[PDB]
Amino acid sequence: LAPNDPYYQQYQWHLHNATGGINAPSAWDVSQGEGVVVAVLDTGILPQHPDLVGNLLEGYDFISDAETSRRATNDRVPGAQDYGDWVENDNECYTGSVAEDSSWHGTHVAGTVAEQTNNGVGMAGVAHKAKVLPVRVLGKCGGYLSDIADAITWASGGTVAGVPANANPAEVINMSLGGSGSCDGTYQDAINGAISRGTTVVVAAGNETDNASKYRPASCDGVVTVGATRITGGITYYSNYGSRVDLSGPGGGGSVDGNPGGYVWQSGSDAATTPESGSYSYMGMGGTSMASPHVAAVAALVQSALIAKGKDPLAPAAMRTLLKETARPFPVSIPTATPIGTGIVDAKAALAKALE
Ligand SMILES: *C(=O)[C@H](Cc1ccccc1)NC(=O)[C@H](CC(C)C)NC(=O)[C@@H](NC(=O)N[C@@H](Cc1ccccc1)C(=O)O)[C@@H]1CCN=C(N)N1
Ligand SMILES: [Ca+2]
């Protein structure tokens, strides 16, 4: 499928480039992810972006701190509107932090997952007939472990005190987020709960040019940990590495690969602070955060294709194995001290093996 989205051909190398893309054109001849729900646990969403509307579920906002969520109370509430995660001043988030503009990070990630495609508008998405379940866990200066843990529980169909039952449990959770430290205790348990309910959990490896074993959820047991590659097919300058990394997706090399080749391109906004301060746009961003949803969406394509043929969904372990086994080997040597998994997720190869 060669979709008609106006910026697809020039900007979206991560979809269709021969050394650094995920083989999406060929994959889309087989599956577009119809029938699956992917939970995007992130900064929230711009729910009326014209290139996403139609693919979104209402979702929920798990941030329990008014100052972080920018909402009127410390309550968690239905809907996942991103209020904007801008930080006005240096050092507000930690000693040494730098002021910056709103990210609209969750809208970009949701775009990779399910941006409306072949619609004559903007860009394309990977599992573009799936639905995104946006679950807002990150706000000003980030978010809180216990909000992130409960979000995993709910998104995967478990029960959380104080939140109504999830009518749309997700086959796949994407967490383009993390912090330093040991998985485990609260985090590992929430994750184990999602796995026991059949949900595949896909996370970013992190961006510290460091061992993924030192960050969470990158180092948790039972997740698919995703490193980041360049348009070239080689490691990005920032990608974490190490034996916990299972495979990689396109994250964008940054300035060394220029514009657009250094960046992943999707739905977002140019707003500096609040949604109203700007307007719907398409943004280029780089990180393991952009690689992770390519893999999450391939998982969605696979579940969808299985259900369409009347076959059983893969359990989480089988899904991770399939994604690793079918990854395309890197077209550029990876240094043995910085391994980033078996290869770059290959949407078509994963489909072909799952349907054999
Ligand atoms: C996209 O490339 C990155 C992926 C990533 C993976 C691993 C480690 C860090 C980052 N995604 C992001 O940076 C998220 C979106 C944008 C930057 C706007 N933001 C965060 O990940 C966010 N993390 C955060 O708030 N962590 C706190 C809660 C927590 C505790 C334990 C485990 C997981 C999360 C924390 O206390 O660590 C952001 C970046 C990393 N650090 C902070 N504080 N904020
Ligand atoms: Ca589009």
Residue numbers in the entry: 1 to 356
Quote the passages of the study that discuss this structure, keeping the authors' original sentences.
Through the COVID-19 pandemic it gained more prominence by being a key pathogen in respiratory co-infections. This study will present a structural analysis of StmPr1, S. maltophilia’s main virulence factor, an excreted serine protease. It shows the main structural and functional elements of the family, such as a reactive triad consisting of Asp42, His105, and Ser28922.
To understand the interaction of StmPr1 with inhibitors, we investigated structures of StmPr1 in complex with the well-known protease inhibitor PMSF and the peptide aldehyde inhibitors Leupeptin and Chymostatin, as well as the peptide-like boron-based inhibitor Bortezomib. All inhibitors bind covalently to Ser289, forming a tetrahedral transition state supported by the main chain amid of Ser289 and the sidechain amino group of Asp207. The even lower IC50 of Chymostatin most likely stems from two main differences, while P1 is occupied with Bortezomib by a methyl group, Chymostatin binds to the P1 with a phenol ring further stabilizing the oxyanion hole. Furthermore, Chymostatin extends also into the P4 site, while Bortezomib only reaches the P3 site. While the lower IC50 highlights Chymostatins as a potential inhibitor for StmPr1, Bortezomib has the advantage of being an already approved medical drug, which is already in use as a proteasome inhibitor in cancer treatment.
